[PDB]
Specification:
The structure is cut from a larger assembly and holds two copies of chain A, one copy of chain B and two copies of chain D. By secondary structure, chain A is mainly alpha-helical. Chain A has two helices and no strands. Helix content of chain A is 57%, strand content 0%. The radius of gyration of chain A is 11 Å and the shape is elongated. Chain D is an all-alpha fold. The chains are: A mainly alpha, B mainly alpha, D mainly alpha. It is classed as protein transport.
């Protein structure tokens, strides 16, 4: 049990996801980020 | 949060 | 139950203010809502991901 | 109060003050001055930089002469930022203290805490401090490079 | 270091050493010869002139001899005397970038910065700088003219 802040998704990836307002675009961005 | 909120501000002022 | 208790211990690492082992990021209502949703959904569908992701 | 400086200071402190100082008469503005403070082997925080203009520039008119510039640099010697102290402070934006700061947490603290920078200036700090790569802020080598004034 | 000059320069410098041979033994004064160091394809500062007059005065009796005479005006050809790099040099103060700095601003930039001037070297600098003759230093034609000798 440890602090899981900015562990897998940093703030840049989070901002990229926020810029993706549509469901399809955010799915594409998540697929790009999660490898 | 007294270390990683306000001392962050002081650390930035200096850094 | 093992992962249940593991994530329960992880929850107090984020719901209570006690550095460096925890931090007050959330609110009590958010804790309760997340616990409600996860206990409702994922562990009911535990066998789903068990059949897929486990050899 | 142009006396707290040393001659080793005063010499280059003219030479860099002279880089915006007109016809050798000893006078520049305050923004050019804040530019000048920064490359005198010194590291003025803008808060001290302005509190200094408050007492030297008595009315804050924005014009500073060379004995007045020796006056500002006099107190800058008092609040001179040192080597290990910024190495310590970088471990604070790193909330868990893993050894280096993350990618855009640096972009968020320096743009909203302290004497705030900008996203372009954060990228500049990434090229300077984040020598590890895009998002792992190496402050040890960062101190090494800036202490090499 | 006497070999870096050209052979025609070496012959004209045999003539030059005979011009300033007020001692006759084969030594000529360095201070009066400091003017000679600025003419034939050389571009030295006053600081470079004095370094060149005193340091390379190997015989050291105040009047330098011919082998060291040829040794002198070769050390200057080492410095990076390039044409565009001073054009970017002026652009830091020619914020317009058109090739024009004001005469007062030029006297500002030279009497204060880098190798600081003596005012007798600044009035002639403005005059040879304001080739257009409008109280305004045209540093482009200024570049073109001091490329020439």
């Amino acid at each position: 049990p440890r602090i899981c802040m900015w562990k897998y998704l940093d703030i840049h990836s989070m901002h990229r996801l926020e810029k993706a307002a549509t469901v399809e675009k955010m799915r594409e961005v998540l697929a790009e980020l999660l490898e | 949060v007294d270390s990683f909120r306000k001392f962050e501000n002081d650390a930035a002022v200096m850094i | 139950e093992e992962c249940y208790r593991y994530f329960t211990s992880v929850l107090f690492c984020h719901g209570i203010r006690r550095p460096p082992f925890s931090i007050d990021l959330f609110k009590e209502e958010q804790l309760l809502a997340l616990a409600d949703y996860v206990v409702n959904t994922y562990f009911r569908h535990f066998k789903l991901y068990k059949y897929v992701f486990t050899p | 109060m142009a006396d707290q400086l040393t001659e080793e200071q005063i010499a280059e402190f003219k030479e860099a003050f002279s880089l915006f100082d007109k016809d050798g008469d000893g006078t520049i503005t305050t923004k050019e001055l804040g530019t000048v403070m920064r490359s005198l082997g010194q590291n003025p925080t803008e808060a001290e930089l302005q509190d200094m203009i408050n007492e030297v520039d008595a009315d804050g008119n924005g014009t500073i002469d060379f004995p007045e510039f020796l006056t500002m640099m006099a107190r800058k010697m008092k609040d001179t930022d040192s080597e290990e102290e910024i190495r310590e402070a970088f471990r604070v934006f790193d909330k868990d203290g893993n050894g280096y700061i993350s990618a855009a947490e640096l972009r968020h603290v320096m743009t909203n805490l302290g004497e705030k920078l900008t996203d372009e200036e954060v990228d500049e700090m990434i090229r300077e401090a984040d020598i590890d790569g895009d998002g792992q802020v190496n402050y040890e080598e960062f101190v090494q490079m800036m202490t090499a004034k």
